[PDB]
Amino acid sequence: EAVSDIYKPFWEWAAKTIKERLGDDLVSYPIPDGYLRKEAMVGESLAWTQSYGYQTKKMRQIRAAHVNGGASLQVLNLVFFPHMNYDLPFLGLDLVTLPGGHLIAIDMQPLFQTEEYKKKYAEPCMDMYQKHVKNLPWGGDKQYFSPVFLWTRPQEDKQVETYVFEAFKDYINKYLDFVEAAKPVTDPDHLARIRERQLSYLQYRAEKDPARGMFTRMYGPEWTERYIHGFLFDLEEKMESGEYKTGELLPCSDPLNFQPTPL
């Protein structure tokens, strides 16, 4: 038997790190009713999706979907979304384990591909990237890529538990370094372009995310569309709603949660 919940230690470390390094400012982000813990039968075993959601003064949303339907179906989809008054990149950590094998996509998806953006956010990561890409070779077959995109297909669970885990850890820590140092953008022209790039990226993810197929099979189309557009890649809904106010906390009374929520 292969490791059942290979990304459990990944999420636990991320939660510990988020809790410690963002502790002062970290508050809950609202998880819509019906999308905290979703279970279905697959095959043949129970298959659940656990959601986690947080926010800070600089981070519009940190959210994870942790999926587990046994060794053959495991996903950890963790993404950091900055507020629109910062020029920060996203941090995306998309870890997927299937019968075919592992699919690992780790990146700080940049708002811009200019030399000055790369100078600011790519070049400080080059050492980290070159270190980890040695162990995590290109995974095969762009405007949202950074120079330090790690796209790899480990063939053995041990590679995930070691090399992928260390890369996972380094990219989170390096990203949170950027977040600490980042300062509000006040120039209106810069803010207009930041918002354009954020909306373009989130529209792309909401429309083309590969989990749509998996979630539709497990829970049906309606739940899948609401999860994707209403939580995982929810900026456009929150903006059209009028809930999103740049740099402002989204009201939510739920307490911080970092552990599975028994259904």
Numbering used by the authors: 2 to 44, 49 to 146, 152 to 273
Share the article's original sentences.
This reaction catalyzed by PebB is a formal reduction of the 2,3,31,32-dien system of the A-ring of 15,16-DHBV. Here we solved the crystal structure of the PebB homolog PEBB (nuclear encoded proteins in eukaryotes are denoted with capital letters by convention) from the eukaryotic cryptophyte alga Guillardia theta. The eukaryotic mGtPEBB is a globular single domain protein that shows the characteristic FDBR α/β/α-sandwich fold with a central antiparallel β-sheet, flanked by α-helices.
Therefore, we designed an expression construct for a truncated version of GtPEBB lacking the first 83 amino acids, which were annotated as chloroplast transit peptide by ChloroP. Incidentally, this construct contains the full FDBR domain and reflects the mature GtPEBB (mGtPEBB). Crystals of mGtPEBB diffracted slightly better, showing the same space group (P62) and almost identical unit cell parameters. The structure of mGtPEBB was refined at 1.9 Å resolution to an R factor of 21.1% and a free R factor of 23.2%. When comparing the substrate-free and the substrate-bound GtPEBB structures, only minor conformational changes are observed upon DHBV binding. Both models superimpose nearly perfectly, showing a root-mean-square deviation of 0.31 Å (PyMOL super, 217 Cα atoms). A second function is the strong coordination of the catalytically important residue Asp-219 by a salt bridge, present in both the substrate-free and DHBV-bound state.
